[PDB]
Amino acid sequence: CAFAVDAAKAYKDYLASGGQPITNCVKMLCTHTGTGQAITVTPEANMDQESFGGASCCLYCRCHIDHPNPKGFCDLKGKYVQIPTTCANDPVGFTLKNTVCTVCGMWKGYGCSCDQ
Amino acid sequence: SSQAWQPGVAMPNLYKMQRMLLEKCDLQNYGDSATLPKGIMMNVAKYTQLCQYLNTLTLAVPYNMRVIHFGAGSDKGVAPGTAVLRQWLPTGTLLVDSDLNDFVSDADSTLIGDCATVHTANKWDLIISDMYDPKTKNVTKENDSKEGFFTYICGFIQQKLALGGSVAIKITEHSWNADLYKLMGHFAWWTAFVTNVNASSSEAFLIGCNYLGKPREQIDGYVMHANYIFWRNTNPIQLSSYSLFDMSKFPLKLRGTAVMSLKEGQINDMILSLLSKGRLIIRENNRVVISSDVLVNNEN
Ligand SMILES: Nc1ncnc2c1ncn2[C@@H]1O[C@H](CO)[C@@H](O)[C@H]1O
Numbered sequence: 264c265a266f267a268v269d270a271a272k273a274y275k276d277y278l279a280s281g282g283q284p285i286t287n288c289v290k291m292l293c294t295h296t297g298t299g300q301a302i303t304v305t306p307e308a309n310m311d312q313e314s315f316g317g318a319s320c321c322l323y324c325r326c327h328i329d330h331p332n333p334k335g336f337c338d339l340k341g342k343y344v345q346i347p348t349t350c351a352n353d354p355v356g357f358t359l360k361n362t363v364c365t366v367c368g369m370w371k372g373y374g375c376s377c378d379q
Numbered sequence: 380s381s382q383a384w385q386p387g388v389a390m391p392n393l394y395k396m397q398r399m400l401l402e403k404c405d406l407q408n409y410g411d412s413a414t415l416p417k418g419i420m421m422n423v424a425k426y427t428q429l430c431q432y433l434n435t436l437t438l439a440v441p442y443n444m445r446v447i448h449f450g451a452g453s454d455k456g457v458a459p460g461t462a463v464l465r466q467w468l469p470t471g472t473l474l475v476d477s478d479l480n481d482f483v484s485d486a487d488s489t490l491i492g493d494c495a496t497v498h499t500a501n502k503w504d505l506i507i508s509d510m511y512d513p514k515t516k517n518v519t520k521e522n523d524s525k526e527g528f529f530t531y532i533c534g535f536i537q538q539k540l541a542l543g544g545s546v547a548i549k550i551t552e553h554s555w556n557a558d559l560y561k562l563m564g565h566f567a568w569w570t571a572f573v574t575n576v577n578a579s580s581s582e583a584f585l586i587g588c589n590y591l592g593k594p595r596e597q598i599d600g601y602v603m604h605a606n607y608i609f610w611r612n613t614n615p616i617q618l619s620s621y622s623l624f625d626m627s628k629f630p631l632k633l634r635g636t637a638v639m640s641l642k643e644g645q646i647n648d649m650i651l652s653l654l655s656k657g658r659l660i661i662r663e664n665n666r667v668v669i670s671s672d673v674l675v676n677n678e679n
């Protein structure tokens with residue numbers, strides 16, 4: 264398939280053009296005293312984050328399209344994703360645009376302190 | 380009252396013992412809305428309070444626990460209730476959910492279709508249903524016991540709920556079934572639980588705690604629903620979101636409850652006593668296999 268829809272680029276371009284972020288991401292009630300890691304088996308928001316059900320924050324899940332992983336696996340479905348409170352207006356955009364540190368499990372740039 | 384700091388209110392036992400006639404439900408606080416924490420959906424708040432209440436019962440919580448959740452989709456295309464159940468349940472709990480309409484879910488597996496199409500090889504430790512048809516809320520017509528998905532739920536419980544297991548099935552003034560109330564008498568204990576965030580509604584969760592597979596009590600479900608409505612009609616419940624703000628003890632404790640496979644002849648009074656205390660589950664510990672029947676038609 265030389266042709267494949269690039270949903271990620273479409274959403275980024277849509278946001279940059281002033282489009283409204285995807286809504287109805289499922290925010291969880293929690294203590295907000297968790298580890299702050301990015302993607303966890305139960306909500307782990309710290310005081311600076313909100314925790315969301317993972318599937319509802321996944322662009323591919325929400326758009327009903329194939330995941331880019333060759334086996335179609337989803338990093339978020341069945342887990343909880345922690346989103347900085349300052350970015351919680353657009354959890355899908357946040358998870359799409361950012362990366363988890365493979366070492367400490369925090370978001371690169373939003374918790375990871377490994378370059379230190 | 381002090382009820383406002385609870386997750387909700389369970390039917391007081393004395394109301395269960397009445398012989399009321401069925402009346403229209405007229406709630407004092409109807410149309411009031413609770414103030415939910417910023418950005419929190421009603422269905423997350425509601426399931427959170429339900430789970431907070433279930434934490435107070437003698438649920439069996441085995442290793443390799445199996446839970447099935449009917450009516451899990453929303454008009455939003457997501458599954459907020461499933462997200463709360465998976466937060467509540469021990470990590471690794473097998474969670475299956477289902478709905479008539481398509482939705483995306485955090486459950487381990489999701490089946491889309493009428494619940495009547497759903498079959499499972501295995502038994503379950505907990506059954507949750509939020510299935511509801513708002514077309515039942517017809518105040519101009521008689522309020523009779525409903526069939527439809529309630530007929531499926533009654534059979535599903537009797538065929539596929541492990542002994543010792545529990546259920547929470549959503550009902551309303553008009554969405555109810557007499558046999559389902561009668562089946563509550565096949566559990567060691569039961570109630571009708573109203574969440575404090577949705578106390579302005581005639582909704583409740585009918586909860587059966589520790590299934591015994593046989594009647595412990597003979598319940599007339601037409602009378603029991605009348606008793607439930609009488610309770611709601613005479614006991615205004617203050618809308619409250621207070622319990623949502625303390626999540627420290629929310630997770631369901633992994634009790635490691637024992638699972639045994641037993642044939643009906645071996646279920647003696649001792650076994651029945653263990654089942655009744657939340658200390659035993661009886662079912663196979665095989666693989667979890669589910670399916671949905673699909674009707675095939677060629678329209679050409
Ligand atoms: N017979 C049914 N089978 C499956 N889901 C149902 C059924 N009736 C209602 N629901 C679901 O119950 C939820 C509550 O209205 C809705 O998501 C609706 O699709």
Ligand SMILES: [Cl-]
Nearest residue numbers: 598599602603
């Ligand atoms: Cl009765």
Ligand SMILES: [Zn+2]
Nearest residue numbers: 321323324337
């Ligand atoms: Zn996904």
Ligand SMILES: [Zn+2]
Nearest residue numbers: 364367375377
């Ligand atoms: Zn790191």
